[PDB]
Amino acid sequence: SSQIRQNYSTEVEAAVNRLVNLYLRASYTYLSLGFYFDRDDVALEGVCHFFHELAEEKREGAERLLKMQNQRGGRALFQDLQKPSQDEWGTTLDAMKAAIVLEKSLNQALLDLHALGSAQADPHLCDFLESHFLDEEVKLIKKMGDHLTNIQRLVGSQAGLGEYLFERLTLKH
Amino acid sequence: SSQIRQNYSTEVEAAVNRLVNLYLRASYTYLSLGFYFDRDDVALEGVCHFFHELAEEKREGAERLLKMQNQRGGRALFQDLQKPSQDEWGTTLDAMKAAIVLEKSLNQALLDLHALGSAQADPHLCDFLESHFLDEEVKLIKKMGDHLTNIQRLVGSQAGLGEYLFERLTLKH
Amino acid sequence: SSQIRQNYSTEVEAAVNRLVNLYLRASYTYLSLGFYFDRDDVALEGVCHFFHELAEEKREGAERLLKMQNQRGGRALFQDLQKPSQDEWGTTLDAMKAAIVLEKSLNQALLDLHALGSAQADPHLCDFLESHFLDEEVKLIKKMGDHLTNIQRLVGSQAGLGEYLFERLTLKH
Amino acid sequence: SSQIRQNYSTEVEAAVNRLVNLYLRASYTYLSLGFYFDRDDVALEGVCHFFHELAEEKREGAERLLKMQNQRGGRALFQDLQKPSQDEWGTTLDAMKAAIVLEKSLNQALLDLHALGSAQADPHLCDFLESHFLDEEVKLIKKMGDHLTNIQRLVGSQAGLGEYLFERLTLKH
Numbered sequence A, B, C, D: 001s002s003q004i005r006q007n008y009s010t011e012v013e014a015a016v017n018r019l020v021n022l023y024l025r026a027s028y029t030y031l032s033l034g035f036y037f038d039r040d041d042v043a044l045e046g047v048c049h050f051f052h053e054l055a056e057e058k059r060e061g062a063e064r065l066l067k068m069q070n071q072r073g074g075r076a077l078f079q080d081l082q083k084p085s086q087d088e089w090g091t092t093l094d095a096m097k098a099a100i101v102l103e104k105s106l107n108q109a110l111l112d113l114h115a116l117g118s119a120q121a122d123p124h125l126c127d128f129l130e131s132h133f134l135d136e137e138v139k140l141i142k143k144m145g146d147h148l149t150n151i152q153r154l155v156g157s158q159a160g161l162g163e164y165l166f167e168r169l170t171l172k173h
């Protein structure tokens, strides 16, 4: 058992394990989003790349949380990863709306865990979230909001044309 | 005559000669497609480049088959190359639909010859098709499907605009 | 829907989706194994690295399968990922025994899918597994067998000493 | 006197001076540990290096605290440095146990001062500890826990052999 654990509450340890599950589920959702945009009948490579990069970013967030759990002397506990909420993700607009819903839920989970750390007087936990998660999340939600606005400007009455141009002229290929 | 031929059926030898003719005919079809898109009254350079590169790829497939026919001790026999099925190829969409029809027919000819090789217990033939043709063909049909989807998204009610943008922003110039 | 699908059975499409789930579950199992060996009360960094690298390899196998599913015009369908079978993995020997059990099950799933592809006369599927999975799996099982033998030689009556030496002198740090 | 001091409580100023004394005492303890492992009748160079590097790290922590005390307009006050608690440090295991006791006491002193800064609404102090001390301390305690586990695995019934191997194969020389 641990000879290192100090100032690390069972409540934080459990919440950190829950947050790992949320990040892994987010990674899985993005894996599904990316491959949907790779379908021959969807074929938006920039959209595929955007979600594939987010699947890797969320897996890395989960790994940083697991590394921290061991650094503090907590014990990683894994649960089932629920499959993503959809099998098909509709338009780039539908997908970007689903992504910002998902990120808002992750952000609230970070803010909840920060509040628990503050209540528990766990400044290492609070610093860890501030340093590696809170600003990364604000920057990503701002980028998704910027994308949603541009996608929405492009619908007009020529939705196909706008979806193509957004993928060609904003997203990376 | 051959002092090398071993495990190489007359049925495979004949089918390989037929497949050479199919690949050369495909190369000819792509030659015609490329020059149609170079016409001053069509003038889509990315479309011209796309089909010109496929004419070279199909000629190279035919040459690899002929090289293999000699490696096995079979005898190349050439037939007339039928002119392509059209003199004018319509829109980029019409052309890409004709290209995927053509590739599906080539792919079926590869799968038929693989099945004959398997029936004849000719693993060298089966490996040769797996190594140099079957995945090349799946990748090319996937690319053409991706293109068809993007071309179709771009028609809307402004067909000229979509045809220009597809050629400028997806195809190479 | 797909305009590319050719010679790709619904049975193979479903089995490919099952195999993706098996590879993702294997990746998750290895994620749990790696973090267990990073615990302050286990602290075997070479063992941690060995399983962490396998988590990445299994995720990459799943992604290659998903890429192929789209290349063939099949549709990715994701299921829940079952949590790994243990929360604590015992000794390096226990862990390596669990890993070879897991790899044998993956290998049998590859051989089953190859047999289905052969029955369905799907040479692209058969080639894909031969080219990217079957030899990778044989090489990995051979490496794990080599490790198991060395770990077993090192138990003697000084189990702690042998576990340390194996991690220091065979595994990478 | 100071023309810069702003939001810097006398309680924090005094506690910062106490923490400087704790860090300097820790540096002194590590100086004694390092030279003990350099004795001709102990002769564990990796253990000597490990503690000598920690003596320098703790002196640097004290200097950063003194720099910050002046940055805030507080006044450094030095007290006697108590000699270390032992003249001889026993085995590498005894020494590593004494080191983690010492680090746990330093960590608690950091957490206490963070709590005082939070009570005093002194965010600069709180940020300073989060940025330069709290994670450095968690990482060091995790490393010492990892070492303790490896040292403990190596005792078995051949304590001399395990002590040699730990110093040769884990610690730097």
Ligand SMILES: [Cl-]
Pocket (backbone or CB within 6 Å): A083, C080
């Ligand atoms: Cl479900």
Ligand SMILES: [Cl-]
Pocket (backbone or CB within 6 Å): B080
């Ligand atoms: Cl004739």
Ligand SMILES: [Cl-]
Pocket (backbone or CB within 6 Å): A080, C083
């Ligand atoms: Cl369960």
Ligand SMILES: [Cl-]
Pocket (backbone or CB within 6 Å): D080
């Ligand atoms: Cl005095």
Ligand SMILES: [Ir+4]
Pocket (backbone or CB within 6 Å): A034, A038, A045, A048, A049, A052
């Ligand atoms: Ir992609």
Ligand SMILES: [Ir+4]
Pocket (backbone or CB within 6 Å): B034, B038, B045, B048, B049, B052
């Ligand atoms: Ir041209």
Ligand SMILES: [Ir+4]
Pocket (backbone or CB within 6 Å): C034, C038, C045, C048, C049, C052
């Ligand atoms: Ir690790």
Ligand SMILES: [Ir+4]
Pocket (backbone or CB within 6 Å): D034, D038, D045, D048, D049, D052
């Ligand atoms: Ir020394």
